[PDB]
RNA sequence: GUUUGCGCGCCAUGGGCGCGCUCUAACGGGUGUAAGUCCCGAACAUGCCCAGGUAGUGGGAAAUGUAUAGCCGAACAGCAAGGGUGUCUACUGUGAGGUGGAAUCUGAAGGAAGCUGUAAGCGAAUCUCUGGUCCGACGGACAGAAAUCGCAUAUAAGGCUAGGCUUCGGUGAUAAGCUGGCAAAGAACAGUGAAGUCUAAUAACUGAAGCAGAGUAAAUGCGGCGGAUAUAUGGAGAGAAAGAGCGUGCACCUUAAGCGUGGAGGUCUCACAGAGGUUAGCCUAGUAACAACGAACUGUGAGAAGUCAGCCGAGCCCAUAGUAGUGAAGAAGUCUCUGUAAUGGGGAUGGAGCGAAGGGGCGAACAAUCAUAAUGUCUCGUAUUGCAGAAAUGACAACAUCUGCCGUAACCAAUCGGGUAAAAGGUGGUCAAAUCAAGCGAGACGGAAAGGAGUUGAUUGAACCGCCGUAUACGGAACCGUACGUACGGUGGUGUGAGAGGUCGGAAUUUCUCAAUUAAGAGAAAUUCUUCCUACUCGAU
DNA sequence: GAGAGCAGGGGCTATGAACCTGCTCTCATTTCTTTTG
């Protein structure tokens, strides 16, 4: 019956729509995602019969569009009921779940008083699992042998099937967390487990590693998995800290995520980048919206204002280098309100770009108000608006 | 399409090789056959230091100037022949046009071999040693090339900017260079500063190594080797060594804005004829040119402005033109020494030739594209086999798993000693399974289906970035530039900007027609995209 | 304006780094050219 639910016209159309919304690469067949509608209209009976009589290929990284499409169909039918059996503190590749929820729940549990963190990471996941125990776990849940044959055929050969099957594999780890009596959140093969004591956390860590290497079959990494205080814990891009009052543990953008944002911002504000500065401002704005929307549940106000000053400095260097020329620099400085003596003095200091864009007449002519009216969004103001 | 940028000729105020005349170290001495060379003797004025941040006097150590004949002339100021304008005014031509004034810009990095006065800088054979800088292409530094070696270099080597931490801590002056947060180069100013050399005197009153970070790039950095170095490159030691100015000779050699002179091809104007249109009369264009409207085209003569930008282009065609110009002070040809990566340079004969300019066509060659008997396998059996689950009975008291401590200072955060599967404990018993057995696979082992392991031609190469060698000139030695400076030779790299006009060609959309007044079928008017052309207007070099 | 420091808090991973407040403090520039992306 579950292959009849896979091979039902609504599900096939939704898998097609999700594939053409993804707009992924073609694969080994080379077929376009725009070609998928024609090939469905000309092989609907062929695809459905080749799947129902178990003769289908899983042709083998990017999957082929027909392979990714059938993977989508099985994933849309198997993300429910598996989602019904899942735990509450699992947040990765699930509907209505994200990293923000994980950080909120981790903060609430640490604020209960579970200071010591057990970091457990699963290493090289779909390589490490054997297919038979995974697929008899799926068989414990799914009773239709056609689904078992097609899913195993996809495993012996990313797309939405793979994180679902991974979350099925790690739901046993979550189940034994609930059985053991432990507080945790898990996104997707990265889980932090929160207990109260160092002896407790070491014992929990070794018991978990023994469980995963024995019962689950996966092998955990000795390098990435560790025990740590929340000051030393990163999780889904978030660092952590303790507020000086004891009321809250509070989320912090980790230094790696801050460095990622700074790298993308320094790319988007290159001086020699030949696009117009309105385009750089627009791309910078979109990057700022994405990063602030990810980290608005963290505490980064000093970081936001320092990054604002950095962005404005780099944009002033961009504008000054686009003027390029001492008469052009003097003309625009006089236009923006600098007197001609200071404007000529600064404009014939056009080389030393960083120095003159740091201070003085360039800071007055290219002001924060004028950059705001130019189109630049402050990190601080958008951050205060978001939370 | 970047003031100018073409051919040919002339001319040094440019450079060589000679001849002369004069001058050469503040002012004097010496030393000496011989002094511009080597040595010796003052003052004044700055630089620096006697400091506490200054002045003002007293003092003093190195350094510089007055103060070598002389050179040069700022990114210094002024003058300035000329050039441009779609600005304005006059005159003259029938017109294309021309000439003269004002106004404004310009007078440039390549010949008025522009002119005048500076600031600053420089300023003497040769040898030896040494510092710094530059070069050994281009190319993120491969490939290709005639074109250094090794290493490293974009989740950014490296340099630089502002702080922090840990250790330490007084001689200074000359002085090329280095750096000032980076595309590259210069000039300016500031801070430093290599190599050595020189000094380490006097007296007072009134900053270094490192260390991790942060920020900042149109990318080269370090070391070796070889070479260059008159911005008269910083110095040290030798050196009785040359340097400068003026004049004058050489069938001396060269030069893009100087002087003279040529401008085809296209474009435009006028006058005659023919061809036309319209009312013997008048016109022949315009829309940038092609195209299309239009009667507006064709000859002949007379004139006017005017050329002159490498990118695949040897060579041939048109016309100035076999003309200007060069050639007998000796051409072409031939022979012979040779050089480069390539372009060349001598000689000896020979006796006359050689031979331009702008713009269009055609085009060899080159580059890019375009065309011309197993395994395995489908379906059978054979023995197995991977991973679920349930359970007749045995073996035993240990197996997991979750909660973080002990004492002491009269009172604990290894705050004080010890430990971290440390106390005290909870929680669930722990496996071994005879038997039975799911679904999906995996290999074997055989038996039959099948199945098999260049030529030639066409299109395109629109434009652009350069680098390198020689010659020849400049800004500003080098480096960067002057259209890749230009000319001639070599080499890589990028790829077809916008508007407007045409093609209104090909394909799509709206509406008609055919099909049958049926189609996501075909044709047509319009529209859009698109192939292609046009410096016509910009933009880029 | 961009960039620093200080304190100035408290609690815990306690003689450190986290954050969010302030003060409080500096740095002010070649009055010139040239050439390609
Ligand atoms: Mg004398
Ligand atoms: Mg005497
Ligand atoms: Mg000149
Ligand atoms: Mg000149
Ligand atoms: Mg003078
Ligand atoms: Mg002088
Ligand atoms: Mg000198
Ligand atoms: Mg070179
Ligand atoms: Mg290079
Ligand atoms: Mg760096
Ligand atoms: Mg000197
Ligand atoms: Mg530079
Ligand atoms: Mg200089
Ligand atoms: Mg030499
Ligand atoms: Mg000197
Ligand atoms: Mg010339
Ligand atoms: Mg004429
Ligand atoms: Mg001309
Ligand atoms: Mg030409
Ligand atoms: Mg061309
Ligand atoms: Mg060509
Ligand atoms: Mg021309
Ligand atoms: Mg062709
Ligand atoms: Mg010079
Ligand atoms: Mg040079
Ligand atoms: Mg050059
Ligand atoms: Mg140039
Ligand atoms: N020109
Ligand atoms: N060029």
Do the Cβ atoms of A34 and A110 come closer than 8 Å? no
> Tell me, in Å, how far CA of A249 is from C1' of B339?
86
Query: Which CATH architecture does the domain made up of A83-249 adopt?
Result: 2-Layer Sandwich (3.30)
| DSSP per position, A296-312 | TTS--HHHHHHHHHHHH
Environment class of A172 (CB within 10 Å of its CB; exposed 0-12, middle 13-18, buried 19+): middle
Method of elucidation: cryo-EM
Q: Give strand letter and number of the nucleotide nearest A205 (CA to C1').
A: B421
CA distances A108 to A115, A119, A330, A351, Å, are 11, 17, 56, 53
- The DSSP secondary-structure symbol of A293 reads H
CA gap A333, A348 in Å, rounded: 12
> Tell me, in Å, how far CA of A324 is from C1' of B19?
61
> Tell me, in Å, how far CA of A177 is from C1' of B90?
107
Three-state secondary-structure class, residue A59: coil
Task: For A338, list phi and psi in degrees, rounded to 5.
Answer: -85, 145
CA gap A64, A25 in Å, rounded: 8
> Is the C-beta of residue A363 closer than 7 Å to nucleic acid chain C?
yes
Question: Could you tell me which residues come within 8 angstroms of residue A24 by beta carbon, excluding any fewer than 6 positions away?
Answer: A33, A62, A65, A68
Q: What's the helix, strand, coil split of chain A in %, to 5?
A: 60, 10, 30
Q: Give strand letter and number of the nucleotide nearest A115 (CA to C1').
A: C13
Which bases of chain C are under 7 A from a protein CB atom?
A: 1-3, 9-13, 17-21, 27-33, 36-37
CA gap A66, A47 in Å, rounded: 9
Which bases of chain B are under 7 A from a protein CB atom?
A: 155-156, 180-186, 215-218, 386-388, 400-404, 420-422, 438-441
CA gap A360, A350 in Å, rounded: 13
In 10 A of CB A335, how many CB atoms?
A: 10
In 10 A of CB A88, how many CB atoms?
A: 10
Do the Cβ atoms of A321 and A366 come closer than 8 Å? no
CA distances A369 to A123, A133, A243, A355, A385, Å, are 50, 63, 33, 21, 18
Do the Cβ atoms of A171 and A83 come closer than 8 Å? no
CA gap A88, A204 in Å, rounded: 21
> Is the C-beta of residue A386 closer than 7 Å to nucleic acid chain C?
no
> Tell me, in Å, how far CA of A340 is from C1' of B325?
61
CA gap A186, A219 in Å, rounded: 17
Q: What radius of gyration do chain A's Cα atoms show?
A: 27
Return the closest-CA partner of residue A68 out of A21, A131, A9. A21
> Tell me, in Å, how far CA of A272 is from C1' of C37?
9
CA gap A127, A110 in Å, rounded: 33
Q: Give strand letter and number of the nucleotide nearest A145 (CA to C1').
A: B439
CA A351 to ligand 12 centroid distance, Å = 9
Q: Give strand letter and number of the nucleotide nearest A301 (CA to C1').
A: C20
């Amino acid at each position: 019956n579950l292959m009849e639910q896979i091979l039902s016209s609504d599900n096939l159309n939704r898998a097609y729509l999700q594939v053409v919304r993804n707009k992924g690469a073609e694969g080994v067949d080379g077929m376009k995602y725009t070609e998928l509608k024609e090939h469905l209209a000309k092989n609907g009976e062929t695809i459905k019969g080749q799947l129902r009589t178990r003769k289908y290929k899983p042709q083998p990284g990017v999957p082929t569009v027909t392979d990714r499409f059938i993977q989508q169909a099985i994933a849309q039918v198997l993300t429910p009921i598996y989602e019904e059996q899942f735990h509450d503190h699992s947040y990765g590749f699930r509907p209505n779940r994200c990293a923000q929820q994980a950080i909120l729940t981790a903060l609430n549990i640490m604020n209960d008083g579970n200071d010591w963190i057990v970091d457990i990471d699963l290493e090289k996941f779909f390589d490490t699992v054997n297919h038979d125990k995974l697929m008899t776990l799926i068989g414990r849940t799914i009773k239709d042998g056609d689904v078992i044959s097609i899913v195993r055929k996809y495993l012996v050969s990313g797309g939405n099937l793979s994180p679902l099957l991974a979350n099925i594999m790690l739901n046993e780890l979550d189940k034994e967390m609930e059985k053991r009596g432990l507080n945790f959140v898990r996104y997707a093969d990265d889980c932090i487990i929160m207990v109260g004591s160092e002896m407790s956390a070491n014992r929990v860590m070794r018991n978990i590693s023994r469980f995963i290497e024995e019962k689950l079959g996966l092998k955990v990494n000795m390098t990435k998995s560790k025990v740590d205080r929340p000051s030393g814990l990163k999780y889904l891009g978030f660092g952590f800290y303790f507020d000086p009052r004891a009321h809250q543990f509070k989320a912090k953008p980790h230094a790696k995520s801050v460095a990622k944002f700074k790298k993308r911002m320094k790319e988007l504000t290159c001086r020699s980048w030949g696009v117009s500065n309105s385009y750089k401002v627009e791309k910078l704005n979109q990057l700022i919206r994405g990063w602030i929307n990810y980290f608005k549940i963290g505490s980064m106000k000093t970081l936001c204002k320092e990054l604002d000053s950095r962005i404005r400095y780099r944009l002033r260097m961009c504008i000054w280098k686009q003027w390029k020329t001492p008469q052009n620099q003097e003309k625009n400085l006089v236009k923006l309100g600098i007197d001609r003596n200071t404007a000529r003095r600064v404009a014939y200091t056009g080389k030393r770009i960083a120095y003159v864009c740091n201070k003085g007449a360039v800071n007055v002519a290219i002001s924060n108000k004028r950059l705001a009216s130019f189109g630049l969004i402050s990190m601080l103001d958008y951050y205060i608006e978001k939370c």
